[PDB]
Amino acid sequence: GIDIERHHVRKSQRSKPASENVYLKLLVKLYRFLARRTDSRFNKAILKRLFQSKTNRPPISISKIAALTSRKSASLEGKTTVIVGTVTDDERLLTVPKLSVAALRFTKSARARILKAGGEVLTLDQLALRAPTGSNTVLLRGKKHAREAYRHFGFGPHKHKAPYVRSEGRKFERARGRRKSRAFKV
Amino acid sequence: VRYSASPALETKCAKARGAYLRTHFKNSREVAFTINGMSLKKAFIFLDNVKEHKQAVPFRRFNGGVGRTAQGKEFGVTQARWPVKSVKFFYDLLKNAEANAEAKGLDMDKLIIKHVQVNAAPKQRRRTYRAHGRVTAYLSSPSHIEIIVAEE
Amino acid sequence: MKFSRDVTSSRRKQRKAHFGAPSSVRRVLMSAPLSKELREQYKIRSLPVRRDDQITVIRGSNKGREGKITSVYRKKFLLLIERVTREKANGASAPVGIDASKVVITKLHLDKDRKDLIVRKGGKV
RNA sequence: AAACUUUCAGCAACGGAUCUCUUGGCUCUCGCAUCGAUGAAGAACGCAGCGAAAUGCGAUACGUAAUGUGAAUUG
RNA sequence: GAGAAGCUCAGACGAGUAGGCAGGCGUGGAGGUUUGUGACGAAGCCUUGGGCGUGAGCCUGGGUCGAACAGCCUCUAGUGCAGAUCUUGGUGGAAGUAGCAAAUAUUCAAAUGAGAACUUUGAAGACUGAAGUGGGGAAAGGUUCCAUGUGAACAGCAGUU
RNA sequence: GUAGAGAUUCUGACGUGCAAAUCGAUCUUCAAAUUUGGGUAUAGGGGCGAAAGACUAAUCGAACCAUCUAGUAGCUGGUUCC
RNA sequence: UUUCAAUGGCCCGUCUUGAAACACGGACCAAGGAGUCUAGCAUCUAUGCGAGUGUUUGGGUGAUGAAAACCCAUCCGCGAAA
RNA sequence: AGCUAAAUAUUGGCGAGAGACCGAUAGCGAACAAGUAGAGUGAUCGAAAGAUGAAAAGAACUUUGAAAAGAGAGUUAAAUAGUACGUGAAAUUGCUGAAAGGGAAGCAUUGGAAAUCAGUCUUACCUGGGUGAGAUCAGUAGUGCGAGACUAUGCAC
Ligand SMILES: [Mg+2]
Ligand SMILES: [Mg+2]
Ligand SMILES: [Mg+2]
Ligand SMILES: [Mg+2]
Ligand SMILES: [Mg+2]
Ligand SMILES: [Mg+2]
Ligand SMILES: [Mg+2]
Ligand SMILES: [Mg+2]
Ligand SMILES: [Mg+2]
Ligand SMILES: [Mg+2]
Ligand SMILES: [Mg+2]
Ligand SMILES: [Mg+2]
Ligand SMILES: [Mg+2]
Ligand SMILES: [Mg+2]
Ligand SMILES: [Mg+2]
Ligand SMILES: [Mg+2]
Ligand SMILES: [Mg+2]
Ligand SMILES: [Mg+2]
Ligand SMILES: [Mg+2]
Ligand SMILES: [Mg+2]
Ligand SMILES: [Mg+2]
Ligand SMILES: [Mg+2]
Ligand SMILES: [Mg+2]
Ligand SMILES: [Mg+2]
Ligand SMILES: [Mg+2]
Ligand SMILES: [Mg+2]
Ligand SMILES: [Mg+2]
């Protein structure tokens, strides 16, 4: 006998994508090699995010990219933005600046507006050629907790989360237990 | 039809069989076991003696409750009977095998019963009436019999 | 390939319609090819067989035999041909049936209706 | 030593699984609108050379007339 | 090169009900594919032969048999049994056992017949004993009536009846 | 006291029966509130009852048939390969 | 493979704190035999598109052969505001 | 007070075409003389049961038997298809063979005994040795400029 207590025994991470997309497999093949034959944390970051599910790879819009790369103390002037995910458009940004973006996917509107403003769109394999270790790159992520489910997670007394309701209005969970005039509030 | 065995020269043997014979399977097995291996002439003598209650058929397997007799002594048993209905079917089948051998010109002096087998035929069904308005089976147990005699 | 909505390719229906066909329908079902000489003479590929027609057997153990059609047993889709028999146990000769598709007609029992059937079928006399 | 009992195999029984089949079922879709006092639906009894159940038929009775086909029916 | 879904080096570890997850095995049917198997024997089945897998299972020799069937990638489901006093069918040990003992009772000869305790004839011995084991009817049955034949099944033994 | 109608006791026989109530002996009644054929009426919360919750086709403290109905079960049983 | 010898081995399933139980089911064999389909909801994953998204209520090539494929307008649902 | 087509419905009836459906304990209760046989006074209840073979060629005739049948024969591709008929499992049974057995049997481990099964080896490839005959091989000549592979005409005999 041996007295071993085993808590973090099996690693909890993905070692490969769940996707069967053959081209994603080709990108993983490229970045398995790059993350192994370089000392770059950027390449290990790309390889890890290439495995992640859709909900763990939220989109980012060109407005957020334009805002994140144009801060007052930025120096992120002429550097390529990289996201392992989809780049969407923000139609509210009437005038798009000149941007260099590397992404898994571009929305048709996002791609057209980036190019029309004189910028450039790259796939991740084109990025690997240009910056094989991700030097002078802005690695970005979308907002993970913006999806609907995070309005509800952790619902409970005084947690101020959203209930699961079929309809919204009075008569739909706004009565006893939700106000002082009806027994108690939450 | 196929006999269950061929323990003899095809040219020096004869065959007889009966199917769906309405005589008791258990009694017939005991008769067959006793006459198997006998000479044909002595089998006829023994079968006639069983008819006369001069000799008996030892009941060796299906012997539950069979009575005792001093005629079982010659076979070293105590339980023996005289199932004459089964005896008659065997006597007729043995006569048929003898006639079959006489047709093939075998020497009717060395003929030995080389093979005899009883198989349980499909049962025939009757009913009997039991107390409290019940009905239970009253079946018959007919037999298939095959015999092969051969020169010794 | 069939295209008509009025044609069924159902195996169940086709088999029911074949084995349940009435007597007059079975007559057309029991057709035989005409011989090469007869095809040219009458411009007809095949006909429903008939009693007193002359055929030769083209398939089976009786291939190459010839004779009149003594009877058309439509209930069994069988032709009985003269002198095509087999021996029973007791020496009597039992006729052997042959399918109409397995013979070729070498001489037709031409008569008024048969002559009308040749002209109607586009043939010549 | 047999008999006896037990297991296995061959062969023979008993029984009808398995496999293959299928003029049947089930389901879907398309199309159609037509019972009866001018006696319906249903019931009974009869009708064939040899026919009891089914099909058919009604003392004109496995049918008459009429039309089509064109040599069978068949145990 | 080493199905990169690959290859290679190393260390630690191994109970499990209820329960959870993964990877596999097997079955019917669907799409694709395999100059796929097959009357020179498909499928199925038997086996006192062989091989593979930790296992689910799989392959094969011999026998039997006679008309279809399989591998690989996918699709799909009425998809896997020891149990449910489970269902339907078949078949056992109990067993040649329990038993076939109410209602007095049979016997001799002949005929017939392959065969007679049980048929028929004669003889004897008996019984019901007129509130009958006699002679009719009503209800109910429906051909059971009669003659000639038969004797598989039935007549819980027998059968020429 | 016989026929008929009953059914006390043996707590007899039988108790996988001759029989889902019978058999033997014994016993009750035997000219009337008697026994009984046929016809006829009463039908299920209904009938009918000299009353035992009896009887109403081997069914009765609410018959039998079909349907609602695969009624519901915090309960019992089962729940198929590695 | 069979059998022998030596050593070990209680009858499975089940409910149970606890079954070899003097707890229940199970004589035998075959075939059948039990988490399904549907209207929703929730998490997680994949795919498409993305401030949008959803051709199948409908209409068209359509007659040929057409329950498929393929194409096409206005609404509308959900989302873009509480 | 009143009438009215179409677009809508349709587990009945009639006709038609289909199916990733079931395949004889399944599928309708009924693939078959099925709402039949059978049960109940009645209302009602309600089954079981498909397959010889291409063709009956459905076994002449002889013989034993009172007969049913058996044995010879015969037909058939097959009777290891005989109508008690395709295949023909298991339970259960008879015969034969093998083996074991002092109040259960079965199983596991290990070997003995007996029975039974597989090695097909030393094949391939390489070299040496013996004789044998033969269109004869390395460098080259010529026919896409420099280097490399190939075939092809000859020489190298
Ligand atoms: Mg026994
Ligand atoms: Mg006794
Ligand atoms: Mg009785
Ligand atoms: Mg473990
Ligand atoms: Mg299925
Ligand atoms: Mg085979
Ligand atoms: Mg075995
Ligand atoms: Mg292994
Ligand atoms: Mg199931
Ligand atoms: Mg079972
Ligand atoms: Mg179980
Ligand atoms: Mg049971
Ligand atoms: Mg006894
Ligand atoms: Mg007296
Ligand atoms: Mg007297
Ligand atoms: Mg009288
Ligand atoms: Mg008593
Ligand atoms: Mg239920
Ligand atoms: Mg219920
Ligand atoms: Mg012990
Ligand atoms: Mg517990
Ligand atoms: Mg237990
Ligand atoms: Mg308990
Ligand atoms: Mg219990
Ligand atoms: Mg029990
Ligand atoms: Mg099963
Ligand atoms: Mg065969």
UniProtKB/Swiss-Prot annotation, chain A:
Its main location: cytoplasm. Signal peptide: none annotated. One of its GO terms (biological process) is cytoplasmic translation. SUPFAM superfamilies: Ribosomal proteins L15p and L18e. Keywords: Cytoplasm, Phosphoprotein, Ribonucleoprotein, Ribosomal protein. The modification Phosphoserine is found at S135. PROSITE patterns: RIBOSOMAL_L18E. One of its GO terms (cellular component) is cytosolic large ribosomal subunit. There are 2 genes for eL18 in S.pombe. Component of the large ribosomal subunit (LSU). Mature yeast ribosomes consist of a small (40S) and a large (60S) subunit. The 40S small subunit contains 1 molecule of ribosomal RNA (18S rRNA) and at least 33 different proteins. The large 60S subunit contains 3 rRNA molecules (25S, 5.8S and 5S rRNA) and at least 46 different proteins. eL18 interacts with NAP1. Component of the ribosome, a large ribonucleoprotein complex responsible for the synthesis of proteins in the cell. The small ribosomal subunit (SSU) binds messenger RNAs (mRNAs) and translates the encoded message by selecting cognate aminoacyl-transfer RNA (tRNA) molecules. The large subunit (LSU) contains the ribosomal catalytic site termed the peptidyl transferase center (PTC), which catalyzes the formation of peptide bonds, thereby polymerizing the amino acids delivered by tRNAs into a polypeptide chain. This is Large ribosomal subunit protein eL18B. The gene is rpl1802.
UniProtKB/Swiss-Prot annotation, chain B:
It is found in: Cytoplasm. One of its GO terms (cellular component) is cytosol. Keywords: Cytoplasm, Ribonucleoprotein, Ribosomal protein. Its main location: cytoplasm. GO terms for molecular function: structural constituent of ribosome. Signal peptide: none annotated. GO terms for biological process: cytoplasmic translation. Component of the ribosome, a large ribonucleoprotein complex responsible for the synthesis of proteins in the cell. The small ribosomal subunit (SSU) binds messenger RNAs (mRNAs) and translates the encoded message by selecting cognate aminoacyl-transfer RNA (tRNA) molecules. The large subunit (LSU) contains the ribosomal catalytic site termed the peptidyl transferase center (PTC), which catalyzes the formation of peptide bonds, thereby polymerizing the amino acids delivered by tRNAs into a polypeptide chain. There are 2 genes for uL22 in S.pombe. Belongs to the universal ribosomal protein uL22 family. Component of the large ribosomal subunit (LSU). Mature yeast ribosomes consist of a small (40S) and a large (60S) subunit. The 40S small subunit contains 1 molecule of ribosomal RNA (18S rRNA) and at least 33 different proteins. The large 60S subunit contains 3 rRNA molecules (25S, 5.8S and 5S rRNA) and at least 46 different proteins. uL22 is associated with the polypeptide exit tunnel. This is Large ribosomal subunit protein uL22A.
Curated annotation (Swiss-Prot), chain C:
Transmembrane segments: none annotated. SUPFAM superfamilies: Translation proteins SH3-like domain. CDD domains: KOW_RPL26 (cd06089). GO terms for biological process: cytoplasmic translation; ribosomal large subunit biogenesis. This is Large ribosomal subunit protein uL24. One of its GO terms (cellular component) is preribosome. SMART domains: KOW. Component of the ribosome, a large ribonucleoprotein complex responsible for the synthesis of proteins in the cell. The small ribosomal subunit (SSU) binds messenger RNAs (mRNAs) and translates the encoded message by selecting cognate aminoacyl-transfer RNA (tRNA) molecules. The large subunit (LSU) contains the ribosomal catalytic site termed the peptidyl transferase center (PTC), which catalyzes the formation of peptide bonds, thereby polymerizing the amino acids delivered by tRNAs into a polypeptide chain. InterPro entries: KOW, Rib_uL2_dom2, Ribosomal_uL24_CS, Ribosomal_uL24_euk/arc, Ribosomal_uL24_KOW, Translation_prot_SH3-like_sf. The gene is rpl26. Belongs to the universal ribosomal protein uL24 family. Component of the large ribosomal subunit (LSU). Mature yeast ribosomes consist of a small (40S) and a large (60S) subunit. The 40S small subunit contains 1 molecule of ribosomal RNA (18S rRNA) and at least 33 different proteins. The large 60S subunit contains 3 rRNA molecules (25S, 5.8S and 5S rRNA) and at least 46 different proteins.
